Amino acid sequence: SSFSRAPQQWATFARMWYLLDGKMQPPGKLAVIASNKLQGLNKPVYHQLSDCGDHVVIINTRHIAFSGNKWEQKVYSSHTGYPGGFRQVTAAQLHRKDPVAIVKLAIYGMLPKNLHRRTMMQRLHLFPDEDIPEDILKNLVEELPQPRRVPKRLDEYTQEEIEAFPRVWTPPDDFRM
Amino acid sequence: LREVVKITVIEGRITETPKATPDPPNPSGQCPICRWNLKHKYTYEDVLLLSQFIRPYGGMLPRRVTGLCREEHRKIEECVKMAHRAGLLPNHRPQLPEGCLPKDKPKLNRYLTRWAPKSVKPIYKKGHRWNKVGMAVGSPLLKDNVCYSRRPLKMMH
Amino acid sequence: YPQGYVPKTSLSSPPWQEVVLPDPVEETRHHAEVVKRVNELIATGQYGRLFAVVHFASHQWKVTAEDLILIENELDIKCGERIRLEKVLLVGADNFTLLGKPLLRKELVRVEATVIEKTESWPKINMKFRKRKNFRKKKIIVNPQTILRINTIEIAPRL
Amino acid sequence: GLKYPAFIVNLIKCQVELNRKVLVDLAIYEPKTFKSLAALAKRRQQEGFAAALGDGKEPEGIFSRVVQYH
Amino acid sequence: AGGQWRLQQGLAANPSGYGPLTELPDWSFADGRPAPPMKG
Amino acid sequence: RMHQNQRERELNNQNPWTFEHIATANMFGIRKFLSPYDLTQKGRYWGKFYMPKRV
Amino acid sequence: TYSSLPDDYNCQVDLALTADGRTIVCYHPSVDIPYEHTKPIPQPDETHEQILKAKLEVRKSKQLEQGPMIEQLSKVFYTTKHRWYPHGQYHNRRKKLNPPRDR
Amino acid sequence: GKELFEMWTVVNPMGLLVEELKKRNISAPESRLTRQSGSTTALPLYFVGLYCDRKLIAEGPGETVLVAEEEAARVALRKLYGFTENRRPWDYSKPK
Amino acid sequence: KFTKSRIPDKVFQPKPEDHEKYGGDPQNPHKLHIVTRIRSTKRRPYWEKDTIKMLGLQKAHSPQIHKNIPSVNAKLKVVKHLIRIQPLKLPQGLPTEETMSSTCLKSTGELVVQWHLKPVE
Numbered sequence: 001s002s003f004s005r006a007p008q009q010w011a012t013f014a015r016m017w018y019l020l021d022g023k024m025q026p027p028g029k030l031a032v033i034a035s036n037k038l039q040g041l042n043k044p045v046y047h048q049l050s051d052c053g054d055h056v057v058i059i060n061t062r063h064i065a066f067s068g069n070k071w072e073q074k075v076y077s078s079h080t081g082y083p084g085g086f087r088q089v090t091a092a093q094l095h096r097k098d099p100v101a102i103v104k105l106a107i108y109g110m111l112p113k114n115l116h117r118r119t120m121m122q123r124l125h126l127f128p129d130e131d132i133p134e135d136i137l138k139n140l141v142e143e144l145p146q147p148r149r150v151p152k153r154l155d156e157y158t159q160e161e162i163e164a165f166p167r168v169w170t171p172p173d174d175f176r177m
Numbered sequence: 178l179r180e181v182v183k184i185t186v187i188e189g190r191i192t193e194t195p196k197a198t199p200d201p202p203n204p205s206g207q208c209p210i211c212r213w214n215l216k217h218k219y220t221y222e223d224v225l226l227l228s229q230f231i232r233p234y235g236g237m238l239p240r241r242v243t244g245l246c247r248e249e250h251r252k253i254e255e256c257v258k259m260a261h262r263a264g265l266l267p268n269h270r271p272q273l274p275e276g277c278l279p280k281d282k283p284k285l286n287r288y289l290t291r292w293a294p295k296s297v298k299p300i301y302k303k304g305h306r307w308n309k310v311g312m313a314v315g316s317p318l319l320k321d322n323v324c325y326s327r328r329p330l331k332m333m334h
Numbered sequence: 335y336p337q338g339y340v341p342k343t344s345l346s347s348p349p350w351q352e353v354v355l356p357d358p359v360e361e362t363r364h365h366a367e368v369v370k371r372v373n374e375l376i377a378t379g380q381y382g383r384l385f386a387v388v389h390f391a392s393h394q395w396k397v398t399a400e401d402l403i404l405i406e407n408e409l410d411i412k413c414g415e416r417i418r419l420e421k422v423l424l425v426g427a428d429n430f431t432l433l434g435k436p437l438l439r440k441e442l443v444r445v446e447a448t449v450i451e452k453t454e455s456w457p458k459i460n461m462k463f464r465k466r467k468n469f470r471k472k473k474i475i476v477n478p479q480t481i482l483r484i485n486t487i488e489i490a491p492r493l
Numbered sequence: 494g495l496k497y498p499a500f501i502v503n504l505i506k507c508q509v510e511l512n513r514k515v516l517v518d519l520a521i522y523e524p525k526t527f528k529s530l531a532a533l534a535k536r537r538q539q540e541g542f543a544a545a546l547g548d549g550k551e552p553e554g555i556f557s558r559v560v561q562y563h
Numbered sequence: 564a565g566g567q568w569r570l571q572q573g574l575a576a577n578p579s580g581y582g583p584l585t586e587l588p589d590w591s592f593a594d595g596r597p598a599p600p601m602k603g
Numbered sequence: 604r605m606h607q608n609q610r611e612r613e614l615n616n617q618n619p620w621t622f623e624h625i626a627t628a629n630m631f632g633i634r635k636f637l638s639p640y641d642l643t644q645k646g647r648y649w650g651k652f653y654m655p656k657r658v
Numbered sequence: 659t660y661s662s663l664p665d666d667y668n669c670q671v672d673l674a675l676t677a678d679g680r681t682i683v684c685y686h687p688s689v690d691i692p693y694e695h696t697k698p699i700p701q702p703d704e705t706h707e708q709i710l711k712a713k714l715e716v717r718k719s720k721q722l723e724q725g726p727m728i729e730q731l732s733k734v735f736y737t738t739k740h741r742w743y744p745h746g747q748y749h750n751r752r753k754k755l756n757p758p759r760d761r
Numbered sequence: 762g763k764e765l766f767e768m769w770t771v772v773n774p775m776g777l778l779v780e781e782l783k784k785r786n787i788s789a790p791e792s793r794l795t796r797q798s799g800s801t802t803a804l805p806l807y808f809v810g811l812y813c814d815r816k817l818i819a820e821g822p823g824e825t826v827l828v829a830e831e832e833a834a835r836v837a838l839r840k841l842y843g844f845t846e847n848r849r850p851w852d853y854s855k856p857k
Numbered sequence: 858k859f860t861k862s863r864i865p866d867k868v869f870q871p872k873p874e875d876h877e878k879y880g881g882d883p884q885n886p887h888k889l890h891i892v893t894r895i896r897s898t899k900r901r902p903y904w905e906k907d908t909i910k911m912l913g914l915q916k917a918h919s920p921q922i923h924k925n926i927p928s929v930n931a932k933l934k935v936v937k938h939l940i941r942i943q944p945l946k947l948p949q950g951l952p953t954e955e956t957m958s959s960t961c962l963k964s965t966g967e968l969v970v971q972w973h974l975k976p977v978e
C-alpha cells in the first residue's frame with residue numbers, strides 16, 4: 001500500500017519463474033502443476049482476458065517414470081499428410097529419439113483449446129538433465145514440491161533402520177541357501 | 178546355514194543363523210505375517226519385509242522353509258517381482274556365468290508393473306468414450322488391502 | 335512389544351498427520367488477553383480507514399466511507415436524506431477485524447448513508463425465442479433505481 | 494494450503510454467512526483479513542476431526558459451539 | 564453447501580429463509596424513526 | 604446343495620433393499636417401467652435367461 | 659502458538675472468542691522482512707529503455723525487414739509472431755476514441 | 762483519491778528524505794534488495810527496502826533497481842508525513 | 858397394459874423396530890400431517906396429476922396441512938413417491954387468537970407460537 005499508481009499495477013501483474021524436478025515422477029502429475037501456473041489459475045486476479053501466465057522450468061525430463069506397463073502399451077500417432085504417412089510409435093521408442101517429447105505432449109493436452117494455448121507454450125522450458133543455462137538460473141524465484149514420494153532402495157537404508165524393523169522368521173541352520 | 182566347500186574332496190559345514198526377534202505381538206498366529214499383524218498393510222515398497230524371504234540371487238524361498246500359508250506366499254511372490262522391476266533390490270541381480278555382461282541399455286523407470294515388460298503388445302487401436310481399452314496398473318492379488326481413499330483404487334488406467 | 339503393535343510399513347499409518355489441539359483451560363485465558371488488547375486499541379483510537387460488509391436489499395456489499403452504491407428498486411426515501419444500515423457482518427481495520435455470528439451487535443458498529451439520486455435504468459430488450467420471431471414481438475424493460483453514498487463507519491469499545 | 498470445499502464448508506459451521514462475491518474482494522484487497530479467515534476454517538476442520546475420532550461424551554470445541562435464536 | 568448441517572441444528576436449509584438475517588429490518592432513519600415495513 | 608445354497612444366500616443377505624419389496628410396493632412408481640411377470644419372477648428371469656446369483 | 663497457520667510469511671493470526679460468545683476477534687499484525695534475509699544492491703554496473711535497446715540490437719542489414727524483425731521481437735517477449743502484424747482499415751476505424759476510465 | 766506527490770512535485774526524493782531523517786537524529790538508510798524476479802529478461806520486477814539500524818522502514822516495487830529504490834523513498838516519506846493511503850478519512854460529520 | 862395398482866396391506870403394518878427408529882408411539886397418534894411435493898408430475902399417469910391438484914400440492918417445497926383420517930390417507934398412498942410426510946408438533950400448545958399473528962413453523966415440524974428473532978441466551 002501507499003505505492004504510486006504505475007508501480008502498483010506493475011507489481012500485481014508481474015510474471016514469476018518456477019522450477020520443477022522431474023526425476024522419478026509420473027509425467028501426468030507434473031503436467032497438472034505446470035498447466036495450473038501456465039494459465040495463471042494460481043492468482044486471485046485471474047481472468048481469461050488478462051494474460052496472467054507465468055514461466056515454468058522443468059529439469060530431468062529424461063528421468064520421468066511410468067506406472068504399470070505404459071512404456072510398452074502407450075502409442076503415439078501422427079500423420080505426414082501424404083498417402084502412407086501414418087506412423088504409430090510406442091512411448092519407449094519416442095523417449096529414445098526425443099528426451100522431452102513425453103512431458104511436453106502431456107502439458108499440451110491439458111491446456112485450453114484456443115489460440116492462447118500456443119502463447120503459453122512459449123513460457124515452458126524443458127531440459128533433459130540437471131544442467132540449466134546461466135541466464136535462466138538467475139531468473140528463478142521458487143521451487144515446487146514433487147507430486148509423488150519416491151520410495152527408498154535397500155542400499156539407502158541406514159544400519160539403524162534395518163535393526164529397528166523386526167524379524168519375522170528364522171531359517172533353520174540346516175538350510176543350504 | 179550350511180555351505181558346501183570343495184577342497185577332489187568336498188565337505189559341508191553348518192554355521193549359526195540369527196534368530197527371530199522374541200515376543201511376537203500376536204502369538205497363536207499360524208503364519209508369520211499374522212503373528213505380527215501385517216496381513217493387509219504391506220506393499221511392493223516395503224523392501225525390509227520382502228528382502229527377508231529372498232535368496233542372494235533374487236529367487237523366492239520354498240514355502241516349507243518359510244512356513245507361510247498359501248495366500249501370503251502368493252502375495253509376497255508377486256510383490257517381489259514388482260520390487261525387482263522397480264529397481265528396488267540393486268544387490269540381488271542375476272549371476273553372470275562366465276563372460277556375460279549387463280546389456281548396458283538405458284533403464285526406464287517403472288513402478289506397479291504387473292506383467293513382464295518383454296511380452297506386452299502395444300495398444301494400436303484404443304477405444305472410444307466408454308469402449309476404451311484399459312491399461313492395467315497394479316496386481317489383482319492385493320485388492321483387499323486397507324484403503325485410505327474414499328473410493329477403491331483404480332486398477333485400469 | 336505391546337499388544338496391537340504393527341511394524342512400520344507403507345500402509346501401516348494413515349497418510350494424514352494427526353494434530354493435538356491446545357488444552358481448553360489455557361486457551362480461554364489467552365482468549366481473554368487477546369480481547370483486552372484489541373479493546374484498548376479501539377479505546378485509544380489507533381486505526382485509520384474502516385471497511386465493513388453490510389447486507390442490504392438482498393445483496394452483500396463491501397463498503398468504505400465515500401463509496402457509491404446502486405440499488406435496483408425504489409426506496410421511499412427523499413433525496414438528501416440520511417439512513418442507518420443495520421445488518422453488518424464484518425468490520426475491519428489494518429490490524430484487527432471483528433466477525434459476527436452471523437451479525438454484529440448494534441452497540442459495536444454504526445454505518446450511515448445518504449440518498450443521492452433516484453433514477454431509472456436504460457431500456458433492456460427482451461425477445462422470447464419463438465418460431466416466427468419477427469422484429470416487433472419485442473418488449474422494453476426499464477426499472478427504477480436509487481444511489482446511496484456511504485458516509486461514516488464508527489466503532490465503540492464494548493467488546 | 495486449503496482446498497475449496499474444506500474452506501467454504503467449515504466457515505458455514507462457524508455461523509459465517511459471507512457470500513462468494515464478497516470473499517473474492519477480501520482476498521484481492523484485504524490479504525491479512527483473508528488469512529485470518531483461512532486459519533479459522535482450518536481450526537474448525539481440525540475440531541471436527543478430533544470429535545469424529547474420539548467417541549463418547551467429550552467437551553465440544555471452543556469454535557464448535559452454535560449460538561441459538563428464538 | 565452446508566444444507567444438511569443447517570437442518571441438523573434446526574435451522575432452514577437455505578440461509579435466505581426464516582431467521583434474523585432475512586426477517587429483521589434492513590435500515591432505519593438516522594433520527595431513530597422506524598422505516599415502513601418491507602413488502603416481502 | 605444348489606437349493607440349499609440358494610436358501611442360505613437369501614437369509615444372510617446384507618442388502619436392505621431387494622427387488623421383491625420395491626416392485627410390490629411400487630416405490631418410485633417403478634412399476635411404470637416393468638412387466639406384469641416381474642412381480643412373479645421377482646427379477647430372477649429375463650427373457651429366456653436364468654440369473655444364478657440374483658437373490 | 660495457538661494459530662494453526664505458520665506466522666512467518668504474511669501476518670500473525672490470533673483468534674479469540676468474546677465472553678458472551680457472539681463475536682470473533684482477530685488480531686493480525688504485519689511481519690517485516692529480516693535484515694539477514696536481504697541482499698545488497700549491485701551498485702557497480704539503468705533505464706528500462708536502455709535494457710530494451712541492448713535486447714533489440716540492430717546488427718545486420720541495418721533496419722531489418724518485417725519478418726526477421728518480428729522473429730527477434732517474439733524471442734525477447736516470449737510470444738508468437740502473429741501478435742505483431744498490423745490490421746486493415748476496417749478494424750482501425752472501429753476503435754473507440756475515448757474509452758471510459760474508472761479511477 | 763489523490764496521492765500526495767500528484768499534487769506536490771518533488772525531484773530527488775532521496776535527498777529530501779536524508780535531511781528529514783537528520784532532523785529527528787536518525788541514521789541514513791541502507792538500501793537492500795528484498796525480492797527479485799526475472800532479472801535478466803526484458804520485464805523484471807524489483808523490490809527494494811530501506812533499512813535503518815537493521816530495521817525496515819519502507820519497501821518499494823519497480824522495473825529497475827534505480828526506479829524501485831526511488832519508489833521506496835516516496836513510501837517512506839508518506840509514512841513520515843502521515844499522508845498514507847489507509848490514513849483516517851477526512852471528517853465532514855461536524856455540523857459546526 | 859399399464860394400469861392402476863393396489864398395494865398389499867402388509868406394507869402399512871409397522872414393526873416394533875420402526876417405532877424406535879422414527880420415534881412414534883403406536884398410541885396417541887398424531888392428528889395433522891405436513892406434506893410437501895418434492896418431485897414432478899410430468900411423465901406420470903393422469904390419475905396422479907389430478908390427486909396432486911386435489912391435495913393443494915401444486916408448488917414444490919411449500920408445506921400443506923391435512924387431516925390424519927382414513928379418507929385422506931387413501932389419497933396420499935396414491936402419490937406416496939412424490940411427497941414427504943412429517944407429523945405436526947405443538948410444543949407450546951395450539952395458537953390462540955392472541956398468538957395467531959406470531960406463529961412460525963420450523964423445519965423440524967414444530968409450530969412455535971412466539972417468534973422474537975433474538976438469541977436464546
Ligand code: FES
Nearest residue numbers: 207208210211246
Ligand atoms: S497369515 Fe496366518 S495362516 Fe494365513
